[PDB]
Design a protein around this ligand. Structure first.
Ligand SMILES: [Cl-]
Ligand SMILES: [Cl-]
Ligand SMILES: [Mg+2]
Ligand SMILES: [Mg+2]
Ligand SMILES: [Mg+2]
Ligand SMILES: [Mg+2]
Lengths: 5, 195, 125, 233, 204, 222, 221, 195, 211, 195, 5, 5, 195, 5
């Protein structure tokens, strides 16, 4: 996997 | 790397602009500072999908709150975030900092870690890159700082967070919340890297 | 390990240790083998300077290697036991792998092979 | 069986008309932590070879020592050590390729991806890749890690096949490499702005450039990007 | 325990000049054990032909389901369903079971009765449409069929020539797959006549 | 955990004629969805009119070819420069492969050349040394695409004599080097279209009594 | 490989035309550019059935919304409806979309991931060949692109995917959405992967295949 | 439950079903009838998971008997087999599927033809001249491929069946305690008492 | 599928020729009978390499025996060399089924089943492989000691054909051997492609198949 | 390998051993002798892992036969059983243990007494009036507890053994294809051909 | 399987 | 992969 | 929390005094600054057992080096540490900082992370608590600092590391390596906590 | 656990 600061 | 800092005239939100899929940077110009009300904003860390879904629901709740009861407090906004994060803790990965300006309460900062607990603080840091600046931020933070001092504090802090954290980078976005209104700031690598 | 080459050639092309081993055989009590039309007979001498012997328990001169093969010998009695033991083990090992008892030729070839190995192995006579 | 601890990211390289260019950033990452910033991942062997190494830095330092020892051993009882019997890139590569495959075959690999760039005694360009599996391949452009995904596409636009190599100058080739290093800084989360670049030319020899920086970056458009969809402020 | 390779079987469909062909093997087994050598995998709803490979229970179930739906379609629309429309109905019906799918690789073949255009289409088990000018393949020997079709196929084949090409594509692909073969059927479809031929193939 | 194996993709194809034999292979080397090289040869002249390809895990393929080439060299030293017959090479390679039965070479091996009667020979090996002489064999990523086409076009499988009621089979006959190279090029263009790991270039090694000739053809680079 | 590039007076999206089934190419010329509304188009990567099904569903609901409100649909409406749908299914609907279009508000370019996260940009790339494409976009993109420059950059970004990514191949589809004009869908804008003439015709002599039975099939009532 | 065979001949369907019921290391019973009469001219043999087999067979029996009373009419073997298949086809995607394999032997009075249907627990229906479930098939199919003819009498069918049971008794690991044989023809269902 | 049965007129040995890699049919022309010597045969089932390698090795060990002992090795001794070898590798994952079929003066016609988990059995009838049960079904139901050489050869051939048909992992062609007091005799390669239809027509069997 | 029984009576030891050799779903052989004569008056039956059983039995046989030749003397059943136990006791802590269970039936010529020893693969030795290995014991032990007497004749022992085989043939799941019976007494070892 | 640039 | 009647 | 800092007159090693078993403090007065030679010391982090075993072996090697070749260089000491840490990387958990004073080379610092790689640096930080002071140490470190400045730098740095890291605490030990000799310093909570 | 700043 997913998009993850 | 995200943080929100209260000061004399109100509060400033700060964030990097990096979104990652493993070691790949999916977005290098991300906006992690998001409006849930005119002068109530949040810093988003964790799952991009989860934090967006939450912020969208909170913005909906505070818009419906405003229609009926007028402008909500920063504490009210933090309560709505908490309620979503706490009750859905098993299915969410969201580390959110809620920051808002009242005329009565001035600048307020609430941090909401993974568990869905609420912590009201003079300033808050969160995200993977925050670990590297606990020492720095604790030593350099003062209450009732000026706007320029707070901007330098956030800039220097996130500069170090970005320098050491691979998961943090790009530009440093900042949002200034005062009685004057809402001001967006941006700081590019060529400036902050060589601090 | 003891490595010394004890069995070696001499100028005249003899291996004295092998030839001196034959002298030990020549000293040993007489043993005779005669094969008839439907049988073999192994005769063996026993020297009569030993009275007060116990013939029940005294090692017999003729040894069974298997139920169908026998081995008699002349020379050093102690040496003969080592060959007989090896031959008896090989006899059981043959039955185990070939599912058939040894031929007399095969058992002989094995015992002869052991004797030969001790004529060009280091540290042994 | 290993796991890499302190790691180096992309190594990128390409052939041009008279020689080869190779580059690699000066970072030693400790997972997500950008721990070491003064790490040289390009190691020259004589005046005609450069070995660019990515992956585990402890294993890289081991390979440095092997190559250093190889030069010493080659000099022994060798009057032509600095002439006809000097170490060739092909000799240095085949040695590393032998070691890499022997170590993978003992289930104890050197956790690295290596590019040997150099110029042979006859002037021929040498560029060949080897990794922890002992896998070897050669191409007009070679890159490791993120470089394979992002650099190769850009470098292949310059040298798409063998016939494009004589048409490519050192100016054009270096420009493409420096551009590729900028793209990797934009998009690789375990990359640094500071990097080293090496040119091995059959005429001008070995040129080793240290303390280079990614520059002429585009960030200005970021100020116009607000929210993630609907947000106007 | 891979539903798509328990029973085995293959379907292939090709276009020609003003004609389409669809062929299938006759094998139904339980892994190594061959059970039936009469298990046809091609059905038709009016002039639209549907071949189905994969789990045999789902092949039988979907046939009965599309007969059901095309019969109601015809009563309400007062006309036979067309291949382009039927293709969309198959896609709809498969994606309806997105998180509990039918373990099938269906193949639509037919000629639009209005335009006269030859039409073929293939699907994955959750209803993604794979439309093609040339050929569609499906089953346990799909790799083999892809290789045979891609090399043997040429455009604008006459029905009698197209028959030879599709037959040779199926037969040689089936002979390199353990779970396919045991007989084969080929449908040659022209605008207003359909010929069905049983091929002689090796019964191992 | 460390995985000592990898898949470098590519596909190879061996066809035997009456007085010749071809061993073809694409020149593309890959890992996952990345291209490593568009031209990395994996069909080698090993000497004594033997051509060899070990397709699959390149590192194991290079090691095997390297060891067989070395086996040919020592065969000359130990047996008075005697020529290693293709049948003798095949048996030698079985022992090379089976020697690592409990840590295999992850490769499909094909060798081609001439038998001792001067006739075209192709041998194919599994990863652990089982070998078989054939007129025809495809190996590697696109073997499942190419092989049934070769059954049809080289060995005339499922092809009967027209008008004989499927009773008389199409008679077997040797193919000309010209007809074989047509089948190789059509096999590889077909495999390139439908297999993502196949493309870039095709390298064919042709073996006659005169020696080993090479032919190179471009393939699609997508 | 799918890309989106903003320019002067609108936005352009592009895609390759390869559909895979493991290492096999199932469709050499599949259409990955989808129409949500007349002037809102969607490039789709990931699970093929999911991208088509989710794009058709939101396209259906957008049409009904457009009729209800007597207004041309907005890109943010398609974006919001898609992301809320994908989020609800927690990434199990494997649709990775680049959503672009023009509406009364202006020209827009977004990306959506399977888990329901959205991104804003002037240039975006999704799919297995996104890194090859993004390398080209990062190298050649600039502010104030013309229509013809944006199409060139978009098709160049797809070509990088076609050549260097094994997941991508065949042709380049383009859709140009310019403000004040009809959206032009350029199906097979580039065809740089034409199959070369075969060496031989494999047309069989008639009667080659052995037949057991013939029968006329009744299709009529 | 283990061995169920079926042979369709000229004028009848013959079902053979093992008598053994085994649990652990004990043969609890050696006289078990693994069949239910669905209608006067339709017989179903069954084998599979303990409990499921009988529960399923009796459920089908009840449904067919209900149909017979309602319409005062006997459903065709084809109709009954299609009904049974659909029940199993539903079952396989249930919370707990019926793990039951069945043979349906029937005589169609309208067609004057015997019919044998083999249906597995997945709902996989096939009409066959001879059928088997479980490991039985691995011996009997090859045997029947050789010895079976389509125009055989009931007596020839029983001799052909004896040849199958002998082969199974010789080569099968488990003792299945012989078979109960039943014939389905124009005159209905009867049991062979001496086998 | 491979069988070997003893009868009045010696031994019949029949094997298929198929090689599989899962559901991929890799070959239809594999030799599964190894000719150890003019009086010894070895059948091969399981791992292709394991069988092929160790049975050619067995042939070398049988040759060394007759050099050392000036006498052809017994079927018992030959089978036991292979069984003692695979037993050393027990647990290592060898996959081998073999029947060592041959004639000697002292033994007469003899068949030994040897597998990779160390089992060694003397017997009159054996069927080994993925399709052994299909071969057993036909062989057992038609087997008699008093079969003629002509009928025995056919039954062996017909038993493989039966397994080649039903078993998905068997087929290609049938390889026939007849072992007598005078040694083994090859009785040809029979392609199932032609043999199936020839048998169906002539025998009237395989009524399950569409004629 | 499955069923091995042993009964010690007044003047003899009787060993009964199943004839079936099963691999998968095929009975490969129905005439297997699961015993080796260790010496003229000592017999060992065996059951367990395929290959291990025969390899172990023949290894013990070879060692006892070697002893007999060396000393021109027959080892007592007690001595042989102790030797066998020690070999298995070594084996169980080896890299790959012998998975073999044995019964040793012997007649001690010095004591003029029959002796039955039961030894499992762990090297667990017991002298018993009657013994069994595997699932056989679960039926035969209770049966022999009831019907066994210490002063029985060889004929009475064979009738008692027939009662065990009948019970096993009735209640055992697997077909073990009857038993080979062997008697060990003062006159040595002989086989009962008709059982 | 499923179809998946 | 390796080959295995 | 450990660090070593080079300065004008030589080098200073610094460390906390906390040893933990989970969340229990096994030792609150630990000495992590250990002598391998007169003026070559190391900071130990990771496994207490591993780091002690390594330091003991290195001290043995350098004592044997001194007997033969005279005083070893700090680089030589770091090489011996590396050799042990690199060659036994699979069985060790040891993060060691090597610091020494030569008269030629002055103060030198070598850090050896988990992998067994060597890094020569002006200053080094390591241990769980180092993460929190990367930002602080980078911003505040200067080359050629005075003794008093370096002591304040280490004191302030470890103070923050201890404050944020639960795995760090107790006293701050320091060891000063100069031409003058070896000086041990200690700083108690009451002093450093309120910095 | 073992003892482990
Ligand atoms: Cl975001
Ligand atoms: Cl300690
Ligand atoms: Mg960074
Ligand atoms: Mg087949
Ligand atoms: Mg391709
Ligand atoms: Mg078959």
């Amino acid at each position: 996997x997913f998009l993850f600061x | 790397s995200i943080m929100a800092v209260t000061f004399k005239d109100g509060v400033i939100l700060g964030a990097d602009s990096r979104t990652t899929t493993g070691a790949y940077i999916a977005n290098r110009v991300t906006d992690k500072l998001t409006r849930v009300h005119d002068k109530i904003w949040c810093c988003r860390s964790g799952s991009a999908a989860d934090t967006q879904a939450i912020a969208d629901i909170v913005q909906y709740h505070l818009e419906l709150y405003t229609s009926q009861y007028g402008t909500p407090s920063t504490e009210t906004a933090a309560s709505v975030f908490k309620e979503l994060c706490y009750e859905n803790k098993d299915n969410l990965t969201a580390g959110i900092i809620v920051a808002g300006y009242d005329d009565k309460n001035k600048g307020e900062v609430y941090t909401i870690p993974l568990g869905g607990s609420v912590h009201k603080l003079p300033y808050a840091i969160a995200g993977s890159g925050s670990t590297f600046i606990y020492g720095y931020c604790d030593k350099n933070f003062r209450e009732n700082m000026s706007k320029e001092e707070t901007v330098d504090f956030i800039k220097h802090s996130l500069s170090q967070a970005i320098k050491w954290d691979g998961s943090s980078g790009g530009v440093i976005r900042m949002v200034v919340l005062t009685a004057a209104g809402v001001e967006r700031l941006i700081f590019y690598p060529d400036e902050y890297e060589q601090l | 390990g003891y490595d010394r080459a004890l069995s070696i050639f001499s100028p005249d092309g003899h291996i004295f240790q092998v030839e001196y081993a034959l002298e030990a055989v020549k000293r040993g009590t007489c043993a005779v083998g005669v094969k008839g039309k439907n049988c073999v007979v192994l005769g063996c001498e026993r020297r009569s300077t030993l009275k007060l012997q116990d013939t029940r328990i005294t090692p017999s001169k003729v040894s069974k290697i298997d139920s169908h093969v026998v081995l008699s010998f002349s020379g050093l009695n102690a040496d003969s036991r080592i060959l007989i033991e090896k031959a008896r083990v090989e006899a059981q090992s043959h039955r185990l792998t070939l599912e058939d008892p040894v031929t007399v030729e095969y058992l002989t070839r094995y015992v002869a092979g052991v004797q030969q190995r001790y004529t060009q192995s280091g540290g042994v006579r | 069986t290993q796991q890499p601890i302190v790691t180096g990211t992309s190594v990128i390289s390409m052939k041009y008309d008279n020689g080869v260019i190779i580059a690699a950033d000066n970072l030693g990452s400790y997972g997500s932590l950008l721990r070491f910033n003064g790490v040289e991942r390009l190691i020259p062997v004589g005046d005609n070879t450069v070995v660019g190494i990515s992956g585990d830095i402890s294993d890289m330092q081991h390979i440095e020592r092997l190559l250093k020892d190889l030069v010493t051993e080659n000099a022994y009882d060798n009057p032509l050590a600095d002439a006809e019997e000097a170490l060739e890139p092909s000799y240095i590569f085949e040695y590393l390729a032998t070691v890499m495959y022997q170590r993978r075959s003992k289930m104890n690999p050197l956790w690295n991806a290596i590019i040997v760039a150099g110029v042979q005694s006859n002037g021929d360009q040498f560029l060949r890749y080897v990794n922890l599996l002992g896998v070897t391949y050669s191409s007009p452009t070679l890159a490791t890690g993120f470089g394979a995904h992002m650099a190769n596409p850009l470098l292949r636009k310059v040298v798409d096949r063998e016939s494009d190599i004589p048409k490519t100058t050192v100016q054009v080739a270096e420009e493409a490499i420096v551009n590729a290093m900028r793209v990797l800084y934009y998009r690789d989360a375990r990359s640094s702005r500071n990097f080293s670049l090496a040119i091995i030319d059959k005429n001008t020899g070995l040129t080793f450039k240290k303390n280079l920086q990614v520059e002429n970056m585009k960030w200005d458009f970021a100020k116009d990007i607000k929210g993630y969809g609907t947000q106007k402020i | 325990s891979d539903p798509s390779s328990i029973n085995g079987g293959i379907v292939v469909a090709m276009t020609g000049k003003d004609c389409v062909a669809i062929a299938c093997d006759l094998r139904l087994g339980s892994q190594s054990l061959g059970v039936s050598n009469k298990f046809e995998k091609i059905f038709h709803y009016g002039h639209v032909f549907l071949g189905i490979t994969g789990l045999a229970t789902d092949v039988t179930t979907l046939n009965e389901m599309f007969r059901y739906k095309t019969n109601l379609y015809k009563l309400k629309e007062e006309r036979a369903i067309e291949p382009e429309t039927f293709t969309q109905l198959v896609s709809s019906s498969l994606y309806e079971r997105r998180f509990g799918p039918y373990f099938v690789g269906p193949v639509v073949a037919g000629i639009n009765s209005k335009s006269g255009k030859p039409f073929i289409a293939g699907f994955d088990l959750i209803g993604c449409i794979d439309e093609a000018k040339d050929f569609i393949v499906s089953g346990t020997a799909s790799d083999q069929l892809f290789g045979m079709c891609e090399s043997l196929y040429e455009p604008n084949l006459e029905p009698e020539d197209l028959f030879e090409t599709i037959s040779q594509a199926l037969l040689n692909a089936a002979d390199r797959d353990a779970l396919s073969g045991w007989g084969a059927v080929v449908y040659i479809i022209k605008k207003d006549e359909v010929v069905k031929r049983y091929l002689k193939m090796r019964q191992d | 955990q460390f995985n000592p194996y990898g898949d470098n993709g590519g596909t190879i194809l061996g066809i035997a004629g009456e007085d010749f034999a071809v061993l073809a292979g694409d020149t593309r080397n890959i890992t996952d969805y990345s291209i490593n090289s568009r031209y990395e040869p994996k069909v080698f002249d090993c000497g004594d009119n033997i051509v060899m390809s070990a397709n699959g895990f390149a590192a194991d393929g290079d090691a095997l070819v390297k060891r067989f080439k070395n086996s040919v060299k020592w065969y000359h030293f130990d047996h008075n420069d005697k020529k290693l017959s293709i049948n003798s090479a095949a048996r030698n390679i079985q022992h090379l492969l089976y020697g690592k039965r409990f840590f295999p070479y992850y490769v499909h091996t094909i060798i081609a050349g001439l038998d001792e009667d001067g006739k075209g020979a192709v041998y194919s090996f599994d990863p652990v040394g089982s070998y078989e002489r054939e007129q025809c064999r495809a190996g590697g990523a696109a073997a499942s695409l190419i092989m049934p086409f070769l059954d049809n076009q080289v060995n005339f499988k499922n092809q009967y004599e027209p008008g004989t009621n499927g009773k008389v089979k199409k008679p077997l006959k040797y193919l000309s080097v010209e007809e074989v190279i047509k089948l190789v090029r059509d096999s590889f263009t077909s495999a390139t279209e439908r297999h993502i790991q196949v493309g870039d270039g095709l390298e064919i090694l042709i073996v006659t009594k005169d020696g080993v000739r090479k032919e190179f053809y471009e393939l699609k680079r997508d | 490989t799918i890309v989106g590039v903003k320019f002067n007076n609108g936005v352009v999206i592009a895609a390759d035309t390869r559909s895979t089934q493991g290492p096999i190419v199932a469709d050499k010329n599949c259409a990955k550019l989808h129409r949500i509304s007349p002037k809102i188009w969607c490039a789709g990567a990931g699970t093929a059935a999911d991208t088509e099904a989710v794009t058709q569903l939101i396209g259906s609901n957008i049409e009904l919304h457009s009729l209800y409100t007597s207004r041309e649909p907005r890109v943010v409406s398609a974006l919001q409806m898609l992301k809320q749908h994908l989020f609800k299914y927690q990434g199990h609907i494997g649709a990775y979309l680049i959503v672009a279009g023009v509406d009364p508000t202006g020209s827009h370019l977004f990306s959506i991931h399977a888990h329901g996260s959205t991104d804003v940009g002037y240039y975006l790339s999704l799919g297995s060949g996104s890194l090859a494409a993004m390398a080209v976009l990062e190298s050649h993109w600039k502010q104030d692109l013309t229509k013809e420059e944006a199409i060139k950059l978009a098709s160049d970004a797809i070509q990088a995917g076609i050549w260097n990514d094994l997941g991508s191949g065949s042709n380049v589809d383009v859709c140009v959405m310019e403000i004040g004009k009809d959206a032009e869908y350029l199906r097979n804008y580039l065809t740089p992967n034409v199959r070369e003439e075969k060496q031989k015709s494999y047309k069989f002599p008639r009667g080659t295949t052995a037949v057991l039975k013939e029968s006329i099939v009744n299709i009529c009532d | 439950m283990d061995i169920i065979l079926g042979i369709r001949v000229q004028d009848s369907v013959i079902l053979a079903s093992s008598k053994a019921v085994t649990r652990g290391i004990s043969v609890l019973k050696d006289s078990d009838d693994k069949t239910r009469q669905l209608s006067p001219h339709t017989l179903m043999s069954f084998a599979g998971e303990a409990g499921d087999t009988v529960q399923f067979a009796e459920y089908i029996q009840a449904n067919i008997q209900l149909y017979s009373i309602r319409e005062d009419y006997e459903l065709s073997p084809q109709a009954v087999s299609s009904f049974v298949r659909q029940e199993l086809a539903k079952s396989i995607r249930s919370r707990r599927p019926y793990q039951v394999n069945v043979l349906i032997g029937g005589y169609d009075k309208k067609k004057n033809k015997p019919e044998l249907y083999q249906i597995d627990y997945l709902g996989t229906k096939v009409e066959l001249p001879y059928g088997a479930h479980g490991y039985s098939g691995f011996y009997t199919f090859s045997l029947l491929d050789h010895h079976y003819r389509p125009d055989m009498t009931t007596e020839e069918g029983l001799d052909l069946l004896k040849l199958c049971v002998q082969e199974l008794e010789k080569r099968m690991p488990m003792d299945f305690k012989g078979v109960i044989v039943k014939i389905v023809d124009k005159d209905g269902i009867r049991q062979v008492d001496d086998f | 599928t491979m069988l070997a049965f003893r009868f009045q007129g010696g031994i019949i040995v029949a094997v298929d020729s198929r090689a599989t890699a899962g559901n991929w049919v890799a070959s239809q022309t594999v030799k599964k009978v190894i000719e150890i010597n003019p009086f010894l045969l070895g059948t091969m089932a399981g791992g292709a390499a394991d069988c092929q390698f160790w049975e050619t090795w067995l042939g070398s060990q049988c040759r060394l025996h007759e050099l050392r002992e000036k006498e052809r090795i017994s079927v018992a001794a030959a089978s036991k060399i292979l069984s003692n070898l695979v037993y050393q590798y027990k647990g290592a994952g060898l996959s081998m089924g073999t029947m060592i079929c041959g004639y000697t003066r002292k033994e007469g016609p003899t068949i030994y089943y040897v597998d990779s988990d160390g089992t060694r059995l003397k017997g009159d009838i054996f069927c080994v492989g993925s399709g052994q049960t299909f071969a057993y079904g036909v062989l057992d139901s038609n087997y008699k000691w008093d079969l003629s050489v002509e009928d025995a050869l056919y039954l062996g051939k017909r038993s493989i054909l039966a397994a080649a048909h039903r078993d998905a992992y068997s087929g290609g062609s049938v390889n026939l051997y007849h072992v007598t007091e005078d040694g083994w005799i090859y009785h040809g390669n029979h392609d199932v492609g032609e043999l199936f239809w020839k048998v169906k027509e002539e025998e009237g069997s395989f009524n399950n198949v569409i004629g």
